[PDB]
C-alpha cells in the first residue's frame, strides 16, 4: 500500500476491508512498516489488526498500544477511534469525560465523526459550556454530501445554539476555522 | 433574608477602564459578585454590550428579571418592570441592543438595575444583584464622551480599497487621500492586520517600461508609508504592473482616470 | 479581442451575446487570457461564461472565483456583479450588507447601476445611515440620456433626502472646484 | 420623572467658536447631552445652521417638538409652540431657514427653547432638551457683528473668474482689479484652497511671438501675486496661450478685448 | 471649419445643424483639433456631438467634459449650456442653485441667453437680492433685434426694479458695463 | 492538563512562524507550564509537507 490510499482507505473505514480483499498478504510487510519506520497510517492499520484480531491474532493492549502511537504522531482517526472506544466501552472502560479531549483533538484537526460525537456528547453534558463555542465553530463550517448526516449536523447546531447567548454565537460565527 | 449584591454608597464607583477611538469601557465592581461591562466599539451602526461578569460562574441556564427597583433613599416610588433575560451557564450574563442603553438611562435617574434570579452555587435560592447609581453620572459623562468620539466604521469597512492618482506626478487624489487617511486612523489604533496587498496600476500614456517602473515606485512609496504606520514589513505585499490589466477604456482620459488606481486589500484571521 | 473592445462590451452587457454570435469560437482564447495573463476583462468575461455556461461547461463555483478575481482587479462591472449576486441571491446565499460594500467600490468607480442599486438598498433600511450622504452625492454627480434612468435617479435621490438633516444634503452638492 | 437637559444659570454659557469672515459659530454646551451649534457661513443668500449635537447619537428618527418655554424666573408667562422638526437616526438634530433665525430670537426675548421627543437610548420615553438664555446677549452681539462682516460670496462665486486687460499696457481693467481684489480677499481668509490655475491670452493684434510674451509676461505676473496671498509655489499653476484659442470673434473691436483675458480657477481641500 | 465661423455658428446654435449638413464628413477634424490642439470652439463642438450623439456616439459623460474644457477655457456659450443643463435637468441632475453661477459668469461674459435666464431664475427666487443690480444692469444695457425678445427683456427688467430701493437702482443704471 | 497534554500545531505556508491559533495554543501551553511545576517531559515532533526537497524538509 502507498501512504496516501492507506489514509484515505483510513477515514472512509475500509482499510480492513481492503486487507482481507487481499486475502491478508501484505501482513509481513504491514508489521515491518508499523514497527520500525513508525508510519502513522500503518500502526494505525496494524493497532486496528492487533486489536480486533482481523488474520493477525487477537493482542488488544498492543494494538491499542499501536493505535495509540497513530494518535502521538497524530492521525486524527487514530485520536477519534481512542475517543469512541472510550465513550462507548468497547475493548476499554467506559469514561465518556476521559473521551472528551480526545474527540475535541481529532475535531480541531478536522475530523467530522469527532466533530458529531462531540457535538453529541456535550448536548449530553459530558463538558463543559466552555466547549460549544469551538464544537460549535466546528459545526457551523463543515460540509458534508450525506443528506442524514447533514440534517443531524444541522439539529446538533441547533441544539449548541440553543445554550449560548447571542455574544459568544456571533464570536462563534465570526472567526478563522477551517478544515 | 435573601442574598442582595449591591455596593453600598460608601462602595460604589465607576470607572472608564478603555477610552480609545476604537473602544470606550465603563466598568462598575459589585462587591462580593464581580463587575457590571459597557461596551461600545467603533462601527457604522449603534452598538452597546452589557455584561455581566461573575467571580463564581453561572451553574445553570436561568431566567432573569431586570427591573428597575427604586434605592432605599426614595420612599413612595414603584418599581418599573425592565425585562426578562436568560443567562447561559459558565457565560457571562449579556444583554443588548435597546436593553442595555434602558439600564444606562435608569441609572442615569437615580435608581438601581435589579437582576434576579436563582442561583445554582446558592442551593437554587433567589438572589438580587444590583448597579448603584451613586458617582455614575460624571462617568457616564465621560463615558458619552468617549461614545461621541469613536470612529464611525470599523474593519470591514476599510478592508478593499480602490484609491486612485492624479494625471501628472505620483500623488493621489483628494477622495483617495482621504481614505488612506481613515486607513492610516484605524490601523494606527489597530495594528492587527496581517495582509496588506498593495496592487498598482497606470495607464496608457507611457511606454511598457517606464509604466512598470513608475508603478512600483508608487507601490514601493506605499510600502514605506504602512511601515511608518507600524505594521511588520513581512505582511507587505505591494506589486507592480503597468499598464498591464486596464479596467477602463484608455481611449478616453476618463478611462485613464479610472486606470490610474491602486488596489490595497487588508485581511486579518479571528482566530 | 483587444481589450478596449472587450470592455466596451462588457460595459454594455453584450459580451455574452456578442460570444454567442461569433458561434463559440473564442473559448479557448478567453480561458487562456483569463487564467494566463489575467486580463481582468477576461476575467469577468470567463468568469461569466463559466457562471451562466456560455460556450462553456457550466460551473458555478469557477465562475464566482473569476468574477471575484476581476473585481479585485478594479473593474467596475465586476464589482457591481459581484454585489448584484450577493442583493439578488443568484448563485449565491442572499446577503444585502454583505453586498453593500462591493456596491460601493463599483459606485465609486462610476458604475450608474452600481448607484442606483445602492440608493435602493439604503432606502431599504439595508446599511447605516452614514452610507446616505455618499450614495447621494454620487447619484446627484450622475449623468445618464436614459430618461428612465434619469427619473429613477432622480426618485432615489428624493428618498434619500427624506431620512437627511439637509446639512448632510447641502454637503453632498458641495465641491473642490467651480465644477 | 422624565429627563430634562438643560445648563443652569451657573452653567449656562455661550462661545464663539469661529469668528471669521467667512464662518461664524456659536456654541452653547447643554451638559450631559452635548452642543448646540449655531453657524453662518460667508454666502450670497442669509444662511444659518443650528445643529444639535448629541454625545449619545439618535437611535430612531423621532418627530419632534420646538416649544418657546419660559423660564421658571417668569411666571405667569404662557408657552409657545414654535414647530414640529423631524430628528433623524444616527444624525445630528438640524433646523434651518426662518426657524433657526427663530430660536436665535426666543433666546433674544430670555426664553427657553425647547426641543420634546421620545429618546431611544432612554427606553422610548419623553425627554426635554433647552437652550439656556443666560448669558446670552454678549455672545449674540458677537453673533451678530460677525454676520455684519461675512464675505458676500462663497466658493463656488469665485472658483472661476474671468479677466480682462487694457487695450494697452499689462494691467487689467479697473471690474478686473475689483474681481481680483475679491479672490484674494477669499484666499487670504480661506486655508482649504489648494490649487490655482491661470491662463493668460490675447488678442490676434500682435505677432504670434508678442502674443505669446504678453500672455507669459501676465502669467508670471499673476503668479507673483498669488504668490504674495502667501500660497506656496508648488500650489500655483501659471500658463500662457498667446493669441491662440480665441473665445470670441478677432476682428471685432469687442471681440479682440474679450480675447485679451486671463482665466482663474480655484480648488479648494474641504 | 475656420474658428470664427464655429464662433459665430456656436452663437447662433447652428453648429450640430451645419455639420448635419456636411454629412458629417469633417468629424476626424473636429476629434483632432478638439483632443490635441484643445480649441474652444472645437471643444465645445466634440462635447455636443458627443453628448447628445450625433454622428458620433452618444457618450454623456465625455461629451459634458469637452463642454465643461471648453467653458474651463472659457467659451460663453459652453458656461450658458452647463448652466442650462443644470437649470432644466437636461443629461445631468436639476440643480437651478447650481446653476446660478455658471449663468452668471456666462452673463457677465456677454451672453443675453444666459443674462435671461438668470434674471427668470433670480425672479423665482433660486438666488439672492446681492444678484439683482448686475443682473438688472446686464439686462439695461442690452441690445436685441427681436421684438418678442425685447419684450421679455423689459418685462424681466421691471421684475427686477421692483425688488431694489432707488439707491441701489440708481447705482445700477450709474455703472460702466460691455457686451 | 487533560485539555492541553497533547497538542498539534501548524505553519504558514512560506515562513518559519507558526499560525495565528496555533501561537493561542502554545500561549496556553506556555501558562500552564510556567504555573506548574510538576510538569517533567515535553516531546517536540515537528514534520513538514512534501513540496520541498528531502533534505530541505529535514532541515
Redesign the interface.
Known sequence: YTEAELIKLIEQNKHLQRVRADNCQLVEDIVARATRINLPAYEFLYGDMLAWGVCVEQDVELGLYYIENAAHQGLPAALEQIGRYYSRGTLVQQDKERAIPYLREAASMGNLNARIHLAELLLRDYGSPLDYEDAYRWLYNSVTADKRQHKRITVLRNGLEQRMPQNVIARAKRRDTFW | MGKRYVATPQQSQWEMVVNTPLECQLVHPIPSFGDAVFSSRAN???NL?F?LKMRRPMGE?RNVSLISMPPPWRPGEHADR?TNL?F?????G?V?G?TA??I???L??GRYPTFSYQDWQSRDQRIEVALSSVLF?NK??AF??C??NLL??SF??I????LHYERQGDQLT??SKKRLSQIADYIRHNQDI?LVLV?T?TDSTDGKSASQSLSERRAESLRDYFQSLGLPE?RIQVQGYGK???????????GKD?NR?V?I?LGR???
Open positions: 457604522k451602526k449603534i454590550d455584561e441556564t425592565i436568560k447561559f451557564k459558565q457565560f457571562d449579556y443588548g435597546q442603553w434602558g444606562l438611562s435608569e442615569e435617574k453620572q457616564y459623562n458619552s464622551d461614545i461621541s464611525k466604521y470591514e469597512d478592508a478593499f480599497t480602490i483628494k477622495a496581517d496592487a496600476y513581512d498591464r490589466r486596464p479596467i477602463a477604456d484608455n481611449g478616453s482620459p476618463i479610472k488606481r488596489v486589500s484571521t479571528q482566530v
